[PDB]
Amino acid sequence: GAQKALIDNPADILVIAAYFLLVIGVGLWSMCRTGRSMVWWPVGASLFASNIGSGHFVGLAGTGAASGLAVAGFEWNALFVVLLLGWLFAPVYLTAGVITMPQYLRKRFGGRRIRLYLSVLSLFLYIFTKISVDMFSGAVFIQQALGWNIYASVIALLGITMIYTVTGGLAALMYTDTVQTFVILGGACILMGYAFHEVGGYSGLFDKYLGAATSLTVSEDPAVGNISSFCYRPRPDSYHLLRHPVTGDLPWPALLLGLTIVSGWYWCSDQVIVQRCLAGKSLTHIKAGCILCGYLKLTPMFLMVMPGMISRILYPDEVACVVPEVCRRVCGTEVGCSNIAYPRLVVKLMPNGLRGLMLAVMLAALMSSLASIFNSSSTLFTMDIYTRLRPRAGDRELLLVGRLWVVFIVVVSVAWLPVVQAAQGGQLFDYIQAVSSYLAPPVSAVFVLALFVPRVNEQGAFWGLIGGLLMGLARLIPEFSFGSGSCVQPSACPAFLCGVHYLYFAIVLFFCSGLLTLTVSLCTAPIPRKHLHRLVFSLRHSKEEREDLDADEQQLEDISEDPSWARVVNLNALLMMAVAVFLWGFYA
Amino acid sequence: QPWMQGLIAVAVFLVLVAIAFAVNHFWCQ
Ligand SMILES: O=C(CCc1ccc(O)cc1)c1c(O)cc(O)cc1O[C@@H]1O[C@H](CO)[C@@H](O)[C@H](O)[C@H]1O
């Protein structure tokens, strides 16, 4: 049931089929075939591509189409945070002898409680933030390509995902990941080129976006009424990075002080970020790659965000639709529709042949990303949480419970899929960053206090963590539950709660849980100094043998650099940051 | 103009690094 749709000419059919035959080709080959050593350039480029996933294209273009240029702010916070990985959070995992921040918080506080809690928190942030967002992004791409419901589309994205996993898949990653990322950035550059051609240049985008609004502004359903021009016409400031502190969609204050709290937690504590970061031969290599990955945080603004805007100019009757009836008719959700910006742009601009390659590669990536995250949530669940409940495991038995977990989280993500669909007025970006502002800032506070206040004991961290979840859930649940609605039909939850921007609530939850940590901490017994060495910043150059806190439950450790190459790397970070800041000043 | 706005931003940032280097030299020997 598909005819004379821009994917149904067999140039693109042959190209999509060929690529998902070549990925199973690399995979069955891989099945039968069978910390250091990565250099500045390759380990910079792995950080970049760690965050370029179809979910990013969808959301960052979509929010581009909705709000103008200031989601690009997001990305330019990222490069200052990656620098601070490369300088602050990367040395600490090197000095401590750890890899994971769970391994660090096992050495730093000691108890099985904080490992248990972060593990359960990580399960909720893969169900809410990774699995459901990836399923949703597949659904969107597929709908714009071959009109199909969300539910039918995920049935298919999970069908191809299961036959990715069982036919090699995650074994044959390094080959597939290198080639997927090369042709995503290739495809993205070609399609950007086509978008700026179609709008009539760069001058075209800027002279045409602020008038790009829809013609259909009235609803059959009364109560909605004659829809206001506040809502349907684009925002009067949408060429600027820095917005009003209080009435901005992405307030300046918030972006700076509050994305750091949340982007910080992502770069300090992700499995993939830290696992790819600690592949250098050296801290100099790590630092110089973390400089190159900044130079790759400005490409997305052109590659992802400006195409969202050109998706609004070219296709305003769909991308910028306001009326509850017309939105459902185009994107399947009353609340809005910007989410279709990047996929609609791919289907309708990229010419025959190339079109299928770009759809194939954006789809094989969600196959890989889903398969990665199912494996990762399975180990974490199978080890941390079952072992604790029942440490009597037949490894056969365990491998069942490992497989039965993946069934449960497929189902709970698919259950959650319509909340992700109309999440923040139909803005995937905002939902991702809003979930991560409700759940991250406690952990941000406990890791920035662990590592710079040695007085903070274990009682402290745990109750900081648990007192941050209750404040955070006192807004994350209440908001996904009273609905969020949108511009046309405002929400219902009150602003004693969901008034303020989610990034401002991240700032308050950061400082609040922080003080819980400090106060429970200073009312209990301190950690003795002897089992704190090369864990706190005050004791990183100590050279004194310590009697580890995890060692109580048991009964690549170099930060050297050539100072000539260290002067080189510190120069290149300061040049890159000046370049970044000038690009920010231009688009402020 | 936007390029005036860019040069203002980098000028402020270099001043910010000068405050940081003065802190490291003077208050963090
Ligand atoms: O996709 C890549 C790129 C691999 C690559 C390596 C060298 C190079 O020169 C170009 C590319 C990648 C990575 O470099 C590090 C990772 O740890 C994971 C990677 O794969 C996926 O990256 C997705 C975003 O693109 C992410 O959502 C997903 O979960 C993840 O598995």
Residue numbers in the entry:
A (entry chain A): 14 to 47, 59 to 579, 640 to 672
B (entry chain B): 28 to 56
What text appears in the publication on this structure?
Unexpectedly, phlorizin was found to bind to TM1, TM5 and TM8 in an inward-open structure, in contrast to the outward-facing structure that we observed for the gliflozins. This binding site is located near the Na2 site, where Na+ binds to the outward-facing structure. The glucose moiety of phlorizin is bound to the bending site of the intracellular side of TM1, whereas the aglycon moiety, connected to the glucose moiety via an ether bond, is surrounded by the side chain comprising A69, S70, A73 and S74 of TM1, D201 of TM5, and R300 of TM6, extending toward the lipid membrane. The ether bond is unique to phlorizin, whereas the central aromatic ring of the gliflozins connects directly to the glucose moiety, causing rigidity that prevents binding to the inward-open structure. Furthermore, the inward-open structure does not exhibit density for IL0 between TM0 and TM1. Phlorizin at up to 5,000 nM did not saturate the hSGLT2-expressing membrane; it exhibited biphasic kinetics, indicating that phlorizin has two binding sites on hSGLT2 (high- and low-affinity sites). In the phlorizin-bound inward-open structure, the extracellular-binding site is abolished, suggesting that phlorizin can bind to only one of the sites (extracellular or intracellular). Under the conditions of our cryo-EM analysis (no Na+ gradient and 500 μM phlorizin), phlorizin bound to the low-affinity intracellular site. We therefore believe that our cryo-EM analysis revealed binding from the intracellular side. After sodium and glucose are released, the transporter forms an inward-open structure and phlorizin and phloretin bind to this structure, inhibiting glucose transport.
